[PDB]
Design a protein around this ligand. Sequence first.
Ligand SMILES: *[C@@H](C)/C=N/c1c(NC[C@H](O)[C@H](O)[C@H](O)CO)[nH]c(=O)[nH]c1=O
Lengths: 235, 188, 264, 96
Amino acid sequence: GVTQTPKFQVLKTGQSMTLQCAQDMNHNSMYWYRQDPGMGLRLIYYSASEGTTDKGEVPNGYNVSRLNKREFSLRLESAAPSQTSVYFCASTLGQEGQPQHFGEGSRLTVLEDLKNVFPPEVAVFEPSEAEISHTQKATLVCLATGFYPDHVELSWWVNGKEVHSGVCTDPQPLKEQPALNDSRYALSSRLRVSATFWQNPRNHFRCQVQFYGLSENDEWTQDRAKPVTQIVSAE
Amino acid sequence: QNIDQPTEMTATEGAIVQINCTYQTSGFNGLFWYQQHAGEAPTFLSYNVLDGLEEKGRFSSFLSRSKGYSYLLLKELQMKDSASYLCAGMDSNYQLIWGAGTKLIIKPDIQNPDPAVYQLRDSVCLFTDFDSQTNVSQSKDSDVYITDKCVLDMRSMDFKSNSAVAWSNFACANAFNNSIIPEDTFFP
Amino acid sequence: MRTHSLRYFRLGVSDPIHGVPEFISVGYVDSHPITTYDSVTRQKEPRAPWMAENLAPDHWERYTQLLRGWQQMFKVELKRLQRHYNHSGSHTYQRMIGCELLEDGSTTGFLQYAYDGQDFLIFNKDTLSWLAVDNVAHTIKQAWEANQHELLYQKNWLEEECIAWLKRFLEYGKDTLQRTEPPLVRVNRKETFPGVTALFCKAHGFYPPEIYMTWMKNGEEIVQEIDYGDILPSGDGTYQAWASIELLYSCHVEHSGVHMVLQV
Amino acid sequence: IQRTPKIQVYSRHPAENGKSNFLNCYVSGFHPSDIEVDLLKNGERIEKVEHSDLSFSKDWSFYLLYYTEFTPTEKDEYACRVNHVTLSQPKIVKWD
Ligand SMILES: *[C@@H](C)/C=N/c1c(NC[C@H](O)[C@H](O)[C@H](O)CO)[nH]c(=O)[nH]c1=O
């Protein structure tokens, strides 16, 4: 299908950024979109065929390269906070309404400074004894708090293996400081198991939160620990 | 020029939902429906260019070129069908006009409601086992946090339930006072 | 209104000689070129002032991109036909798509392809099929018929979109296309080879090009042979034609709802 | 299958010696597209010649119109020299 990199990226206002896209379906046409809340996909630039590109609805602050038939790069000349969005690369066989094939997506966050970038604090909360006795069920609650920007992926692992049954994570994080513009986030998830499953010693429960923050190349002068891409967990 | 679809729709698991889409385009070269799951890429569902109804499993798409509308029909609704449904129409200049999407929420069928609030240690309050009809309201106090209801499916035990979590640096008795909570709610 | 048509042609030439482009696409409203694109200019340009004056830069900007894409697709389709036929050297690939809006309000639509200037595949919008002339065309037809969405798209394009574009361009070019310029018709008598008199009926300065000319003996069509001249462009936007016989003769001319008789 | 061009040389208006007119050379029915057209005045190539862009027929063949402003005379011989792949040497078609 369509392969786009990176899935997440933090940028300081004024920084350059390149998003890569590759399709190995012998498709001719390629597109770069941005997905914002409350609106339909906005086309930035498109490439009708190898050797041609043209502007879309929103081309200002961006430029593109149809490197070859396979690749279509998107460059951000000087990152601006307005460019904080989710970017999708798409490809079509033809131009006459062949279905579009989408890349996995790239969440870009543009900040004036990186001074408020914080990884999450992860804590797991053991099921209530009253729930165990009332329902014969056991609900494990996980909390990821004080993270910024909202670039997280919460997963549950029971006895070293990822689980999806009896799992439910919030679709949108919570603003811990709703009045502030640089509010940090909190995100919960629940894992529900049978009473007897929770009561078995040797059954292991782990909440995992993958944070996408800073990279080795990003400068860090602060007293605190550099808020890099890391996995934070609770058991 | 313009593609219109509802912002959001709520339907019950096992039931049928029809997501409408009306287009006011300068020319017409077909109407597309794409499915986008939360935090995922959109994937093609259907294409219609001539009048009629095209069925692809539990999903069907209809087009009325004279009436300038289309619909995406989902039969035997499943919790898995909770996604955003994107409507797109193609111009006389082969340009896609993308709709803002429709978030489809599937209300689970809660067979044995058992409303109850609980305390948990590593604090945390969990309001759970309430019917899909009750709604969870947002916090009042600054340092008090309440998440909206979220449906878990214990595929194993053929059991679905709703829950909302509360936390602060406060008691579980007072935690959900801003929400119209069932009268038969269990408080240990 | 009279019968009007919209048609677009594509021409692909593999291994072309010097000068000659690899790809040309030209549109027509009746006998009038309306638009042009080639692999050299790499731009869609108007071929009529009324096209240039009525269609905004964005129409030409967008269609140039589509044509750059269509150019590429044509280069590939011709390479596959040559592979199939096991042909080397320079060969042509052509396409003609289009539609007609008849006097009565009914429509016709067509989509055809040629290889080396001979019919290759003819689209049937009524059965959503491709008529293959040979085994190579048959391989393409099988591939093409597999996408039912593409066939349906084409039927909508030929029937709805094409007609809407024609009506649009007919309004833009109203003063050219919908005008009538009546013909100037003369009869010329001559004793050619001894005992052989040739009567020529010559018509000129007419628009539209469709004219009907015939000879009559006493009021019934001349069962003898009538030699018909072609409808030729005079170069001023008008057309000319003729009709001749060898011997009470009369020339009959019918043009744009007016019938004219020239008795000898 | 290659097809040789049909060449038709004719004036715009009924011709009359000493009265200005336009000589037309209509070249049609040919396949493939590469063609060379020239209008001649007593065997010499006319420089001031206007022409249509390559035009397309429903039978897959092509056509063009080449013209020049001219004033016919008894002494002057006008013609249309055409060359195509189907032609061993250029064909000089004389006007009537
Ligand atoms: C400017 C409008 C030029 N158009 C153009 C087209 N347009 C017709 C139609 O949309 C196209 O043939 C599609 O492929 C039909 O499926 N066609 C063409 O060949 N040349 C042109 O310059």
